[PDB]
Write a protein that binds this DNA or RNA. Sequence first.
DNA 1: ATCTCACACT
DNA 2: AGTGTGAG
Length: 427
Amino acid sequence: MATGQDRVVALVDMDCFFVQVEQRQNPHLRNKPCAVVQYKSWKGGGIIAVSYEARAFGVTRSMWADDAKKLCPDLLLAQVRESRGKANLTKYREASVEVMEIMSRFAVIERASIDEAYVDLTSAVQERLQKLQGQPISADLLPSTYIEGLPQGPTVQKEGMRKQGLFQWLDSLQIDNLTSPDLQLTVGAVIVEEMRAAIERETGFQCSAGISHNKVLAKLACGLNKPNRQTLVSHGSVPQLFSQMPIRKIRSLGGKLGASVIEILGIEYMGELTQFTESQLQSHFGEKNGSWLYAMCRGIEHDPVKPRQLPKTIGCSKNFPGKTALATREQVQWWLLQLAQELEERLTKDRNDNDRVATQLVVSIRVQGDKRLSSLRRCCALTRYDAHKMSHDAFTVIKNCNTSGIQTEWSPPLTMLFLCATKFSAS
DNA sequence: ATCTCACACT
DNA sequence: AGTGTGAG
Ligand SMILES: Nc1ccn([C@H]2C[C@H](O)[C@@H](COP(=O)(O)NP(=O)(O)OP(=O)(O)O)O2)c(=O)n1
Ligand SMILES: [Mg+2]
Ligand SMILES: [Mg+2]
């Protein structure tokens, strides 16, 4: 049977990313409790990134800054730039590009968010395993690596635990066997140290990293020892790792599916899924899910690292909650034109940098009284990077959503506007 | 109401 | 084509 040990995969995720970006530009904020907010004049603004000094006081994402200062009175704040009446994340997108290009020097990268990327190191490990003869792997090659599940068997501080575990790992390493999966992950972890040293040297940003045999495990491993540390999760660490791992913490199980696994099967931890046959899991959750759950609770997962460093979509949105929803026709025209103008400058930059053009425009709205994130999506042809054409066209395809008999009145008031360029192709 | 992106289902 | 889910 195939033990899900064919690959070496890392996930690298920046530490409190938006905060690091502001702290590098504004040294006043380094090594202090700070957070990043947007739109300051409602409850100090909503918090979108929290530094680790501020997390020690309880400050979280999604809190209002005014409530955040209640937990942490010395908290310093940085506010997202605002342009055309809405958030502008250019600074963070450009800092993201810095990190992704560096990681792209080492292996194939799958950009998975603005601050993290999966790395398929299988080939780079095979290559490294031949350039280093058969010589041992010194602990000095892994100065920030944790071996999950170690130390074991017959120090009271965290670095002491780290070293002892690493020591036990390396001492037990079969450097004889170029094919041993634990050796492979170790070499992968040496490379990830270098990758993270380069990221920090060249950008000033610290980050953490998971190393394992698949994307789900590498991501789990990444969070085990955040910040500024990397974690190797061997296939053999999985049974004890999963035996008390809440199901909701595994990637793609944090929502409705993970809740129904918990409710239907009557279990709390990943490891309890092993009691069920694959056909049982498939009866409850479908053939693809039951099969994915059957393999995943044994540490096995085959989703590949997609070679993709570039977004497939480029989107633009503003929500208009509560009293602020839009009820004029020309109010809806104006905000569409604001969204299309940011879209145009981002699309122009993308065409110049990446040699591709978006060919479809996706317009989406919500209306007060609805429930879900979106209430209505419609598409149209994107033939010119012209903000006025994009907004006019986007209006045309939604203007019948206006149930109002009136001319200039628009309602159910629009709680949300979303424009998204997509279906790119080479140019 | 703290703006984004990917993907499966149909 | 359009909806729903999951995520950072
Ligand atoms: N819901 C979210 C999640 C993240 N983000 C932005 C700001 C985050 O700093 C950046 C990366 O998100 P994140 O990786 O989930 N956690 P972030 O790096 O702050 O902190 P760590 O927990 O990763 O150290 O995405 C956001 O704007 N809205
Ligand atoms: Mg992060
Ligand atoms: Mg992240």
